[PDB]
From a paper:
Human [name] is a type II membrane protein and comprises 741 amino acids in total. [name] acts only on the α1-6 mannose branch of N-glycans, and this process is highly regulated. In this study, we determined the crystal structures of the [name] catalytic domain in an apo form and in complex with our bisubstrate-type inhibitor as a substrate analog.
We tested a series of constructs truncating the N-terminal region and found T121-L741, named [name] luminal domain, is sufficient for catalytic reaction without impairing protein production in mammalian cells. We determined the crystal structure of [name] luminal domain (T121-L741) in apo form at 1.9 Å resolution by the native single-wavelength anomalous diffraction (SAD) method. Overall structure of [name] luminal domain has a cross-like shape and is composed of four subdomains: N-terminal domain (A128-Y207 in blue and G337-P339 in cyan in Fig. 2a), middle domains 1 (H212-K329 and I345-L424 in green, and E606-H627 in yellow) and 2 (G425-Y605 in orange), and C-terminal domain (G628-L741 in pink). As both of the two middle domains take Rossmann folds, [name] is classified into the GT-B fold. As the other human GnTs also require a divalent cation for catalysis, [name] is unique among human GnTs. The four subdomains of [name] luminal domain do not exist independently but instead are tightly connected by two short insertions (shown in cyan and yellow in Fig. 2a), as well as interregional disulfide bonds such as C172-C338 and C372-C626. And, the N-terminal domain is linked to middle domain 1 via three missing loop regions, signifying the highly mobile nature of this domain. [name] luminal domain contains eight disulfide bonds in total and five of them are located at the C-terminal domain. In the crystal structure, only one N-glycan was assigned at N433. E297 is located at the lid of the cleft formed by the two middle domains and is likely well positioned to act as a catalytic base.
Residue numbers in the entry: 128 to 207, 212 to 278, 295 to 329, 337 to 339, 345 to 480, 484 to 741
């Protein structure tokens, strides 16, 4: 109400024609000014803000109210409340929220185990980083899952939101969701899973789209733009019922940083050994023994030749819940987290069999000083060729059993080898026996690293207030992908990551000239594979449907114009200027 009076006051003192500034960072401003010339009477709210038909009034409305146009210094900034978030160092409020429904018992038990580690981490982050003056956000979390990787991630996200001081409302039923949920521009963010999102749409019906900018959707395997755009997915013949939400794809939150079109949420790799356990393990030398990754004996089918090669150099151990198990294997059965990590500390090699795909267990092994033998996949596995991935709303390809371990950890902790190739396996086992490796845990999978990441998303990632401005455009590094290469690939092989919020700044002739791409001619297509550049004719094809901007996808004929950003080593979700 007073924001309307505030903007009207600015317009009352403004010239007829704003001398418009440079549009850098705001590529939709001019198109929306033109839209206002035709449409500022279609809704009385624009006039309620003081819009009077002058183009300067359009500009003022679009910058000050909707943030689609650059901000001008209309008013001075006054160099001088209760609304601030304070970090929490006590869990009783969170437990009392979860003590209402009973499949929260597993999560409460995990949080109680990890409580001291979480509290040390939030205190440590606040001692290193300036966390003052953050606004307390009102957050809804709806766990459709409740109506194991999924549970761990939910637990650590909820814990992180809580430790950072935000006001959380937890919903775990349709009835709870319905009661809670009862331009021109209560709850500010809504964390939800894929099951819960379907429930959200049904509870709200067609008006759900008014809340969609607030959604952060936990989606372990990721959703690519080709599948997120419902009409495009249909035009490609995709039969999967998944995807089709038409969200900004950065609103999907993944388990590992494998899909740069999405955001990486992750989780914490729990530490089960306390200081007494650790001191007792410095007692005992790590043995020349291996431990096979895989709890179900059916995972071991046809792995005998591979294990025999390992068995030539090392004892072979297992934790199996026994047809396919060689008789020389020492089976411990299922172990507690503490007993498992004791075993990992006496173990030189954690042996992947090819399945399961990208879980936490290899990171747990590496964090206890084991090397991981990581089977390589050629062809890479994807929804195109692997029954286990049928219906996934993404063509993402796995190049090994644990692509994160392959790409972001690597040797000497991770030896990515063809398990069928005896020479490659032997070369790895021999080098692992004679190598010095220390326990290693990527910062992003620690309590403190997860808090830093989630804090940055809460403070900086915003889809509800017009122009996306984070990561900052200063971080953009433009690369040309060759034909047959995706934008995801061309950033990754240069130790960068694709940043999909930057595509919109690379989508016309004038913008392309900033990066020494000169288009003699140009056209518009609605295609995930553009902006594209034909270097023979210097013909550019730009994006005609902004929801199809896509890090994934290789152009068969032309070069792709690809927006990369730097990432902080060990914190891939953030650029150095992202905070
Ligand atoms: C270490 O963990 C064991 C759990 O069996 C517990 O008995 C012991 O009190 C713990 N010691 C410390 C110092 O945390």
């Amino acid at each position: 109400a007073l924001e309307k009076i505030n903007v009207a006051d600015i317009i009352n003192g403004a010239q007829e024609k704003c001398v418009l500034p440079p549009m850098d960072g705001y590529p939709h401003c001019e198109g929306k000014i033109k839209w206002m010339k035709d449409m500022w009477r279609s809704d009385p709210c624009y006039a309620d803000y003081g819009v009077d038909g002058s183009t300067c009034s359009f500009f003022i409305y679009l910058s000050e109210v909707e943030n689609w146009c650059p901000h001008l210094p209309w008013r001075a900034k006054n160099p001088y409340h209760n609304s601030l978030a304070e970090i929490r160092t006590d869990f009783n409020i969170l437990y009392s929220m979860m003590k209402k429904h009973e499949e929260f018992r597993w999560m409460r038990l995990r949080i109680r185990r990890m409580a001291d580690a979480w509290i040390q981490a939030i205190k440590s982050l606040a001692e290193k980083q300036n966390l003052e003056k953050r606004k307390r956000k009102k957050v809804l979390v709806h766990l459709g899952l409740l109506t194991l990787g999924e549970l761990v991630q939910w637990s650590d996200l909820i814990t992180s939101l809580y430790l950072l001081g935000h006001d959380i409302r937890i919903s775990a039923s349709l009835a709870e969701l319905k009661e809670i949920m009862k331009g021109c521009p209560i709850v500010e963010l809504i964390y939800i899973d894929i099951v819960g999102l379907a429930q959200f749409k049904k509870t709200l019906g067609p008006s759900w789209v008014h809340y969609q900018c607030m959604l952060r959707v936990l989606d372990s395997f990721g959703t690519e733009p080709e599948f997120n755009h419902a009409n495009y997915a249909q035009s490609k013949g995709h039969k999967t019922p998944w995807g089709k939400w038409n969200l900004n794809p950065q609103q999907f939150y993944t388990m590992f940083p494998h899909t740069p079109d999405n955001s990486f949420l992750g989780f914490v790799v729990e530490q089960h050994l306390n200081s007494s356990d650790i001191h007792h393990i410095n007692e005992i030398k790590r043995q020349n023994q291996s431990l096979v990754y895989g709890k179900v004996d059916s995972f071991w089918k046809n792995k005998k030749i591979y294990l025999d090669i390992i068995h030539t150099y090392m004892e072979v151990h297992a934790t199996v819940y026994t047809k396919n198990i060689p008789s020389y294997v020492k089976n411990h059965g299922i172990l507690s987290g503490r007993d498992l990590q004791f075993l990992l500390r006496e173990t030189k090699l954690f042996v992947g069999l090819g399945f399961p795909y990208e879980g936490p267990a290899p990171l747990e092994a590496i964090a206890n000083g084991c090397a991981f033998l990581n089977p390589k996949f050629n062809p890479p596995k994807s929804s195109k060729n692997t029954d286990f991935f049928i219906g996934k709303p993404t063509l993402r390809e796995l190049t090994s059993q644990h692509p994160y371990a392959e790409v972001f950890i690597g040797r000497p902790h991770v030896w990515t080898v063809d398990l069928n190739n005896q020479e490659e396996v032997e070369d790895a086992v021999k080098a692992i026996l004679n190598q010095k490796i220390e326990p290693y845990m990527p910062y992003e999978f620690t309590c403190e690293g997860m808090l830093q990441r989630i804090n940055a998303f809460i403070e900086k990632q915003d889809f509800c207030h017009g122009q996306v401005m984070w990561p900052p455009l200063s971080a953009l590094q433009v690369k040309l992908a060759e034909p047959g290469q995706s934008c995801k690939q061309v950033c990754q092989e240069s130790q960068l990551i694709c940043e999909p919020s930057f595509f919109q700044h690379l989508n016309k002739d004038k913008d392309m000239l900033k990066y020494k791409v000169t288009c003699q001619s140009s056209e518009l297509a609605k295609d995930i594979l553009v902006p594209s550049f034909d270097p023979k004719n210097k013909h550019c094809v730009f994006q005609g449907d902004l929801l199809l901007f896509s890090c994934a996808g290789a152009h068969p004929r032309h070069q792709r114009v690809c927006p990369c950003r730097d990432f902080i080593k060990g914190q891939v979700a953030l650029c150095k200027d992202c905070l």
